[PDB]
Structure formats: structure tokens, C-alpha cells
């Protein structure tokens, strides 16, 4: 049995072979990836003499027109960003290779999640956190000008990448699940730890929902685990009220899906529907998991400089703020920026 002409295998990735040479322009030398997409490949770009990752997609519609998408944003992004302040990953150019689409990007690093494995789950110092915090707010102030006004969709550790493995600078990558504004189309969307409210809601979405998610991956990002890991949707928002409490009545009397996690008392107040058991709600203290005056989690931050009270105390505000269950009141990227986690002291 034969799939494109003997190039793919019979999940239609390409076969990647060491050393193949591509339109007498790329090596290719080694596989350093794979996903539900295809194939991440490090390759020598002869024409620009320099290395290059190739993103190797499927060839299958679904995931060919996925990549079309990412491309499209990718570009438009890159009208703006010419100087590649904003952190988002490099499109360098596209082009169809023996029937698979072919992104050109700079060679990143791992990922954060990779780095959160590095730690042996146990977390990257608070200093550190703050500088992925930074990063991570300006680029999301990036997709929120008009003229892109792009939802990722999808964050989390995993597409976030390292520029270099000794250092703290980062990118976004993985713009295939994403959409724009006014221009909003799926449902059912974000990975489900870092899934919003809002969407486990069935409600109206715009871009708050990726600073939901960004609150959600800071905390891991100095726990080492996620913050709500919900093995469903249900049991993701009972995790998410254990932290949070009840969401407020405003929001659930509007919500489509209430009634799949909530049950509205004779006063008009909301609860959880019963189990078929949670800490009661909101009585699993962001305080505590953060271990805001017992030395950071697990304790493990007790006698190291850089993780005092007053510097968590800052910390956990913020990610507060970016967990407001309210979509209009949750803090966006321009005053994220501005939050005194971000201002020097001492
Ligand atoms: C399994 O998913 C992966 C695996 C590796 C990478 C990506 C996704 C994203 C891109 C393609 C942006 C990239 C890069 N530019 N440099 C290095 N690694 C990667």
C-alpha cells in the first residue's frame, strides 16, 4: 500500500529522512518534533545560511487548511511586528512541498513545559515567572490591537517556546486554533486546564479568554502543576470553583450551559449541582497554593531571596485579576503591564 506516491506514511506524515535535500535550498537534518499537526524538522536554509525549524504539515485537508490559517495570521502578524519585539514566533515563508504545506519559521528552543519537566515539576522562581509574565502580557497587548485583534485560542505551556535554553526570552507559537474578532466561529475551543469560564459557560468569548489562560499557566509555571485539572468539563469547573467560588448570579442567569455545573435556589442564588467530593467553594486559597507566608509552594521557596511576602502578595493580585470570572472586568494586557508585580522595590 502506497501513500503519496511512497513519501508519507499511512497517517500522512511526511518520512522524514536525515540529510534530504529539499528544492536545492534545504538540509534537513534531524527531527526535533511531533504533533497532531505533522512534523517539526531542523534544517540548514543554504540560500540565507542559516538554520531554519520547518513545520511539516499532514497531508489531509483538516490539518492542511489548520495551517492555512496559521499562516494567514502569521503573516498579518508579521506586517506589524518587523522588528520581532512582541514575542511571537517568526514566519520566515511558506511554500508546498510533495503535497505538504511548509512553515518556515526561526529555531526555537524547547518548550515550557519542557522547562516545567526540567524543574522535575517543582517550578521556575518567582523572578523567573515574572519575566515570562511580562513577555506574555505584551504580546497578548500585541494581538489585541485593531487591526489584528487575534485570539489565540490555545495557550498553555506547551506553545510557549524558548528562544535559547539558557535564557528567558520566549515566543507564542501554534496559531492553527486561532481566530479574530468579529470574525469568531468555533464553540468549543481551548485546551481544557486552561479553559475559560466563559467558554465552559457556552457564552459570548472575545480576547480575555487567553488571559484566563495566561493566569492559569503562571501559577503552574511556579507550582510545577496545573493550577485547575479537570479530567472534563465538569470536573474542570467544580476544580475552578474550588479556587474561585460560585460564579457571580449576573453571569450564570446569562449563561447557556448553567445548568450543566449549577443548580438556582428559590432566592435566585446559585450552587453546585451535587457529585454523583469538592473542597467546599472557594476554600482552596490561591493564598495557599502559591504559599503566599509558608515559603511559596510546597514550602520549598523558604530562606531563597527573590520569594518574599510582599513580592507573592503582588503576585497572587495579579493573577486574581486574570482569573476574573467576569470577561469585562478581567485585567487586560495594557494595565497587566502597569501592575505593581511588574514594579521594582527594595
Ligand atoms: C510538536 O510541536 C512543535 C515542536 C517544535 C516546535 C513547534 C511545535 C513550533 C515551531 C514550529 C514554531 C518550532 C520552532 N520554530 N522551533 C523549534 N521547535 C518548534
Known amino acids: 500500500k502506497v501513500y503519496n506516491d511512497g513519501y508519507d506514511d499511512d497517517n500522512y506524515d511526511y518520512i522524514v529522512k536525515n540529510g534530504e535535500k529539499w528544492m536545492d535550498r534545504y538540509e534537513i ?3 526535533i518534533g511531533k504533533g497532531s499537526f505533522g512534523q517539526v524538522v531542523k534544517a540548514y536554509d543554504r540560500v540565507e545560511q542559516e538554520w531554519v525549524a520547518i513545520k511539516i504539515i499532514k497531508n489531509k485537508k483538516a490539518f492542511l487548511n489548520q495551517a492555512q490559517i496559521e ?4 503573516e498579518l502578524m508579521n506586517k ?3 522588528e520581532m519585539k512582541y514575542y511571537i514566533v517568526h514566519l520566515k515563508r511558506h511554500f508546498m512541498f510533495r503535497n505538504h504545506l511548509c512553515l518556515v519559521f526561526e529555531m526555537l528552543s524547547y518548550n515550557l513545559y519542557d522547562l516545567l519537566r526540567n524543574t522535575n515539576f517543582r517550578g521556575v522562581s518567582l523572578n523567573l515567572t515574572r519575566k515570562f509574565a ?8 500585541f494581538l489585541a490591537t485593531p487591526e489584528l485583534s487575534i485570539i489565540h485560542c490555545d495557550l498553555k505551556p506547551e506553545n510557549i517556546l524558548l528562544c535559547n535554553p539558557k535564557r528567558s526570552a520566549i515566543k507564542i507559537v501554534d496559531f492553527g486554533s486561532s481566530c479574530q474578532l468579529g470574525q469568531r466561529i468555533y464553540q468549543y475551543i481551548q485546551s481544557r486546564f486552561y479553559r475559560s469560564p466563559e467558554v465552559l459557560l457556552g457564552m ?3 480576547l480575555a479568554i487567553d488571559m484566563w489562560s495566561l493566569g492559569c499557566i503562571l501559577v503552574e509555571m511556579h507550582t510545577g ?3 485547575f485539572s479537570g479530567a472534563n468539563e465538569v470536573d474542570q469547573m467544580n476544580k475552578i470553583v474550588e479556587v474561585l467560588g460560585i460564579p457571580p448570579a449576573h453571569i450564570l442567569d446569562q449563561a447557556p450551559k448553567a445548568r450543566k455545573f449549577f443548580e438556582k435556589l428559590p432566592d435566585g442564588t446559585w450552587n453546585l449541582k451535587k457529585t454523583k467530593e469538592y473542597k467546599p467553594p472557594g476554600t482552596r486559597k ?3 497554593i502559591l504559599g ?9 521557596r523558604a530562606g531563597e531571596s527573590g520569594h518574599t511576602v510582599a513580592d507573592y502578595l503582588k503576585f497572587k493580585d495579579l493573577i486574581l485579576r486574570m482569573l476574573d470570572y467576569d470577561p469585562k472586568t478581567r485585567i487586560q494586557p495594557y494595565y497587566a503591564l502597569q501592575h505593581s508585580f511588574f514594579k521594582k522595590t527594595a
Open 29 to 31: 537534518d534531524s527531527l
Open 71 to 74: 499562516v494567514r495570521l502569521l
Open 80 to 82: 506589524h511586528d518587523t
Open 134 to 141: 511580562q513577555q506574555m502580557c505584551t504580546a497578548l497587548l
Open 204 to 206: 459570548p468569548y472575545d
Open 225 to 227: 502543576e496545573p493550577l
Open 286 to 288: 490561591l493564598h495557599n
Open 292 to 300: 503566599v507566608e509558608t515559603g511559596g509552594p510546597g514550602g520549598r
